[PDB]
Amino acid sequence: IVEGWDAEKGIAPWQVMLFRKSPQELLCGASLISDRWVLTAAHCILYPPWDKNFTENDLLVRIGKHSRTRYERNVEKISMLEKIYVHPRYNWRENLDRDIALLKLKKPVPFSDYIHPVCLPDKQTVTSLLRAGYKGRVTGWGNLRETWTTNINEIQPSVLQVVNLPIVERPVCKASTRIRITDNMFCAGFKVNDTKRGDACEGDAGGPFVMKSPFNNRWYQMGIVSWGEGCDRKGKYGFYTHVFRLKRWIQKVIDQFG
């Protein structure tokens, strides 16, 4: 995450890491909606353009971590994936519409001070918090900046980052790019084009875009770090999967275990 900062321990117990088994590789971010289910970006699982087609065995998830690398034993819990459920009408060819997927952990994960699930929004919460101006939060171990001072590939944080970003009006989101965005994605970043800066970059995918309801004091995941052009590019906003819209799908899958 660009322009973000070090996340206090246990700030986001739901934050998850999508780890590739062999070779070991930190692919994307993910969330914990339950002790049996992990939610993440679909393109993190399937992206032909990059010969990217993982399966239950190719990878696993690490939960309750803080460090982007060391193995924080007695804190983080690893879990093997049982079944991956990537949305059917996911569109990896054109605009990356419906970027979403569900992860069924082989064995339920034990909760703790550093691992606790996040809440899926409801028609009521969405309508009141997901509006232009209202700020949300994102977290991940992604790149600290779009670019590489190349002789140095060290732009990857040492610890989970966190940035607070505001949501941008739909029209602007539409204008911002030539790509065709849909009602299955929303964008956030800054137009102010100075004030504050920040955005999610490569490696934040699957990361959750959360908001804390001032009503019941609980944290909700409004979006999923999907795509964007560049990172922290002025006049350019990020794009996350509209979680509430795919609620239906999520429902379907879980209720029928795929």
Binding site: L18, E25, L26, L27, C28, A41, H43, C44, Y47, P49, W50, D51, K52, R93, E94, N95, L96, D99, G142, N143, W148, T150, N151, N153, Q156, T177, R178, I179, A200, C201, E202, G203, D204, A205, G206, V225, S226, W227, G228, E229, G230, F239
Partner: peptide, 26 residues
């Protein structure tokens, strides 16, 4: 140019063998 499809975010692990210049800049 000949393009524009979105830049997916899971970092460039798929091509962390990328670009810059054949060295020469401040």
């Amino acid at each position: 140019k000949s393009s524009d499809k979105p830049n997916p975010r899971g970092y460039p692990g798929k091509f962390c063998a990328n670009d810059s210049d054949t060295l020469e800049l401040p």
